[PDB]
Design a protein around this nucleic acid. Structure first.
Lengths: 476, 476
DNA sequence: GAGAACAACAACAAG
DNA sequence: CTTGTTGTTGTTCTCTGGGTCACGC
DNA sequence: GCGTGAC
DNA sequence: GAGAACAACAACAAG
DNA sequence: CTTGTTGTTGTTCTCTGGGTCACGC
DNA sequence: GCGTGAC
């Protein structure tokens, strides 16, 4: 079991060696921490045990072109390996995927991301099918579906029918999937909601915009070295990082106004009244949680879409204290929530909030359409407990929401009390609710494809990318 | 001596576990080949010999903060360590130093680079002294000087007099250093000559600029992928990327008009003369060499400044059959060759040409002030053939030119044979002739200071940088 | 959000 | 009682798509 | 052909 | 100029 | 004879200062 | 104070 602590003088040398690694190879300190470094390191203590202190590691060590190639091999390896387990879940109908497009920022190749989502015992696989180049082809619907199918046919999946896709609404992808099950990414719809509700309340949105430029100025004026917080720019595509910006302007407020006025540029300090800001960061702060709770890939997401929506309506519940500029937003939101989000919703959404057992109220008409849905799947399609019964049997379920409630677990551990229903919630709750996975994926491609790494080929990135998703879901 | 060669089973379990590293830390393939990374690895095998296949790794390898905490302390020891061997060049008068100003682009702090150059027997070591930030104080001559004593002070030297300083003509450092020996960076100067000679031949400068904006067009419209070369933007900051651009635009010639006209953007190719362009890239091409020989800071450099100029003329020495454009550039060069480049030379450049012994021609008016110089400091700073003869005795030195000639060692083989002389051509051929040693330092500094590395401090950078130069000068 | 540095602290060796 | 080492925890920073595909008129 | 709505 | 990935080749192992 | 593994050479690609300090009218 | 020549 236990392993040798080495001596104070042997510790002391592992310092001054790795210290020199950092220097002569110009690497970041953080890389000693590597969970692949550390294991790689163990394999080189073991080759010390059994070949001892005199070994020529020149020829032992690979060239990096062998690592490049090994990396493409191991990649093809594990792709066909668990390509079986894949083809299973997709025909168990518990298959949903996320897809989005992206462009590297040096070569400017156009790219399609795909991740897959299915449950496996109690686990929830979220993993990268592929990121593959459209090459320089034209980024239309079919080239997407072309490469799309291409991605699945490495796993021999030739049928996308049963696959519920969740995606943003780009005209491209929207009709790239026009002939499949298609679910709208809920993190986007929210953003749509929010940024239209600001378009339409320029009473506020004039300062917001005005803020956006104080950042842009300070940044170009090269200020902020006197701040104690750096002003955070709003980035156009990311979720009202407006909230981030406001908060950041919000903290240096006196220092800004001063520095702005004291450089005479106070012609930029235009709209005063910090207090209407403070309310918006107060408003925007609560949506932060919703976005977070919405893109979660570690546990179910979809079924919390609905309660979040009314959660939005409840942030925006009208108020008498509202200054007239605030009051307007609240309604510009709620309206938008209705006509943008709730109305770009689907049946999988309201079925998925059914399967939170403390749904008493979802009733509406809803369970009408839900039953018709739920039944329409259940009976024939499984490709002493009747199918139409388990429903009302379910309705008599009553739970209290608890500090730790896992709806993930309640179902395998309520199973067989609804042995045809236990197979729905297991299948719908694996559905991710947002196209986040793809973005998360793109984020990681971005640190592969870098200024100095720029020659890297489409296959080494995709291979590099799968592989790290692979040791992620399958290996401890 | 001879070292163990592990099984070809043990091999392919390094090339699977090493790949593991690159995928789980997202590190570059080339990280394996890293030299300091092997003198790292070997200690891990050797550490596996002594304690065997079972070791406690997580206490072993240090925390990334200790490696910073070390790397900055290693900095200390090896700095005021060599403060002796440094000062031994300083008071020996045979030391050189290059300085310039840079600034990072994330945090936008602004830095003072310094390097040192000396010989110490037959070596010629080029060694980074320091990079100290100004903090945000505004970088006039005056607080530059301050940081200079700061950097030099850490090697104990408050007397910076004897130091031959080479730099550009930015007025901040020009003023700042007024009180010491300043020499002018002759690559900067030679760029000016080029820089203006082109401003002043607008029938050439207009197609050149047309080119630049062709480039920036492909980059934006994201062509370049159907080319087989990428177009290479001229950047303002560096020496006639114009070459590399004009060639890069030249090597794609037919494709470019195809793509551009067939984009109906062909109005950008309208002042063309692909003939006259080939001319420029060829004229431009042999300045490359001169640029390279001028900034070499490991071999002697200064001694080439004068003849490099001459070679600039036999480049522009007139040709009848030069379409008039071509020959106006040529003539416009040869003018500022005189009034920018030659005009800024110092007795050092002419002296250093003499101390390259195949100097017959250098006679001119020069040997007048030449000798007034070399003896001006020869007799008095010293710390049977009078000093004045060894010149004339040298003057009778008469040498053939070896393709393999090395005058560093010449002045050592025939050393002491002009004894109160022999070391003057030591202190002279160790002067760098160019400010590039500084830019090299900067280039390196910006591979330290990156997006995700943006948190690092001045110290932790200056430390990292000194070391990498230390291990390079002082370690086999 | 995610790499990546470290400010601040806190346990600890030593003096 | 006052300094000098490793590591732990929590904080801060930087970067974040514009030309291009669908679709209505 | 063009302006609009997503990305 | 400098990291970094790879094409192309050549040297070699193995079917 | 082909096919398959590990290197080696030698090429390619990306990135590149705009607002500041002097100095004279 | 305004412009230029260096970065």
């Amino acid at each position: 079991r236990e392993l040798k602590t080495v001596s104070a003088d042997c510790k002391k040398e592992a310092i001054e060696k790795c210290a020199q690694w950092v220097v002569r190879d110009c690497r970041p300190f953080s890389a000693v921490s590597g969970s692949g470094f550390i294991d790689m390191i163990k394999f080189f203590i073991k080759v010390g045990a059994e070949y001892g202190e005199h070994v020529n590691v020149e020829e032992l060590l690979p060239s990096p072109i062998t690592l490049s190639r090994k990396v493409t091999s191991d990649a093809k390896e594990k792709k066909a390996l668990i390509s079986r387990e894949i083809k299973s879940a997709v025909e168990k109908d518990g298959a949903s995927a996320t897809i989005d497009l992206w462009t590297d920022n040096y070569i400017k190749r156009n790219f399609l991301g795909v991740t897959l989502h299915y449950h496996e015992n109690n686990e929830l696989r979220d993993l990268i099918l592929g990121l593959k180049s459209l090459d320089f082809e034209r980024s239309t619907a079919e080239n997407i579906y072309k490469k799309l199918k291409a991605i699945f046919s490495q796993f021999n999946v030739e049928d996308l029918s049963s696959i519920k896709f969740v995606t943003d609404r780009g005209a491209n992808v929207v009709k790239s999937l026009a002939n499949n099950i298609r679910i709208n990414c809920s993190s986007h719809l929210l953003s749509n909601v929010l940024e239209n509700s600001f378009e339409e309340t320029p009473e506020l949105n004039m300062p917001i915009l005005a803020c956006k430029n104080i950042v842009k100025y300070f940044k170009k004026a090269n200020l902020q070295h006197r701040l104690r917080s750096s002003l955070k720019s709003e980035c156009p595509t990311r979720w009202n990082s407006t909230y981030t910006m406001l908060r950041s302007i919000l903290d240096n407020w006196e220092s800004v106004i001063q520095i702005l006025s004291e450089a005479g540029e106070t012609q930029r300090i235009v709209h005063i009244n910090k207090s209407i800001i403070q309310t918006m960061v107060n408003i925007l702060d609560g949506f932060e949680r919703i976005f977070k709770e919405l893109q979660t890939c570690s546990s179910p997401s979809l079924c919390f879409v609905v309660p979040s929506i009314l959660k939005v309506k409840e942030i925006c519940s009208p108020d008498v204290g509202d200054v007239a500029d605030i009051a307007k937003l609240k309604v510009n939101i709620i309206k938008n929530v209705r006509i943008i989000w709730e109305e770009n919703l689907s049946i999988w959404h309201y079925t998925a909030f059914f399967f939170y057992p403390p749904a008493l109220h979802m009733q509406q008409e809803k369970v009408a359409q839900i039953k018709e849905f739920c039944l329409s799947k259940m009976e024939d399609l499984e490709l002493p407990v009747s199918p139409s019964d388990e429903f009302e049997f379910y309705r008599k379920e009553i739970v209290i929401l608890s500090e730790d409630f896992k709806v993930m677990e309640w179902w395998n551990l309520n199973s067989k009390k609804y042995p045809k229903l236990s197979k729905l919630a297991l299948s719908l709750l694996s559905i991710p609710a947002s196209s986040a996975a793809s973005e998360r994926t793109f984020s990681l491609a971005g640190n592969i494809i870098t200024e100095k790494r720029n020659r890297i080929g489409q296959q080494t990135v995709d291979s590099l990318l799968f592989l790290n998703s692979f040791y992620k879901n399958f290996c401890k």
